[PDB]
Design a protein around this ligand. Structure first.
Ligand SMILES: CC(C)CN(C[C@@H](O)[C@H](Cc1ccccc1)NC(=O)O[C@H]1CO[C@H]2OCC[C@H]21)S(=O)(=O)c1ccc(N)cc1
Lengths: 99, 99
C-alpha cells in the first residue's frame, strides 16, 4: 500500500496469537510491543538511555504479520505508549520512503 | 528519491542560512532542530510530556529545503540529539511509506 503521512501511520498487526495496532516509525531502530506474551527464549536488553535505561525482553526471529505481510524479526517487549514497528521490521516488508 | 530503511534515513537540509542534517521520522508529529537561529516571531510550546515537559520555540511557516525540495512548515527549536523532520514537513515534500 501507499501510506500518506497526514495522520499517524498506524497499521494492524498479528503477533503472538493476538491482534494489535502499531505505529510505522522510521525514527526507531527497533520494534517494541507491550502486553504480548511471546513464547521461546529471550534475553535482557537495555534500551533508551535518556533519564536512565529501560530493561526489556529481546525475542529473536519472531513471526509477525504487518498489513497482511508475514515476516520475521526481533521484537522487544516492554512498556510503550503505542506499539512501534521500527526499521528492523520495515525492511522485512519492503517498506521505503518515497518522494 | 526512494530511501530504504536499512540505515537511519538521514537527509541534507537547508535551514536558516545553514546546512544541516536531519532524520526522516514518521513517528514524530513535529519537526525539531537545535542550534538554528531563525528570524521572525515565535511562540513558546510545551512538547514531550514524559519525565516532565520541554519548552521549545515554535516558528510558523519556516522556509526549509529538504533533499532539494523547497517547502514551508512549522519548526520547533529546542534540544534534540539528532535534528528531526516530522510528519508535518514530510507531507509537504510529498513523502509516503510504500510497500
Ligand atoms: C526522536 C527519536 C530518536 C525518539 N524515538 C522515537 C520518536 O520518533 C518518538 C515516537 C515514539 C513512539 C512510541 C514510543 C516512544 C516514542 N517521537 C518523538 O519523540 O518525536 C519528537 C520529535 O518531533 C516532535 O514531534 C512529536 C514528538 C516530538 S525513540 O523510539 O525513542 C528512539 C530513540 C533512539 C533510537 N536509537 C531509537 C528509537
Amino acid at each position: 500500500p501507499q501510506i500518506t503521512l497526514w495522520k499517524r501511520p498506524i497499521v494492524t498487526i498479528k503477533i503472538g496469537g493476538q491482534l494489535k495496532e502499531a505505529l510505522l516509525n522510521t525514527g526507531a531502530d527497533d520494534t517494541v510491543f507491550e502486553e504480548v506474551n511471546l513464547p521461546g527464549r529471550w534475553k535482557p536488553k537495555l534500551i533508551g538511555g535518556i533519564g536512565g535505561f529501560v530493561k526489556v525482553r529481546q525475542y529473536d526471529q519472531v513471526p509477525i504479520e504487518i498489513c497482511g505481510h508475514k515476516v520475521i524479526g526481533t521484537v522487544l517487549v516492554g512498556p510503550t505508549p503505542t506499539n512501534v514497528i521500527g526499521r528492523n521490521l520495515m525492511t522485512q516488508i519492503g517498506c521505503t520512503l518515497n518522494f
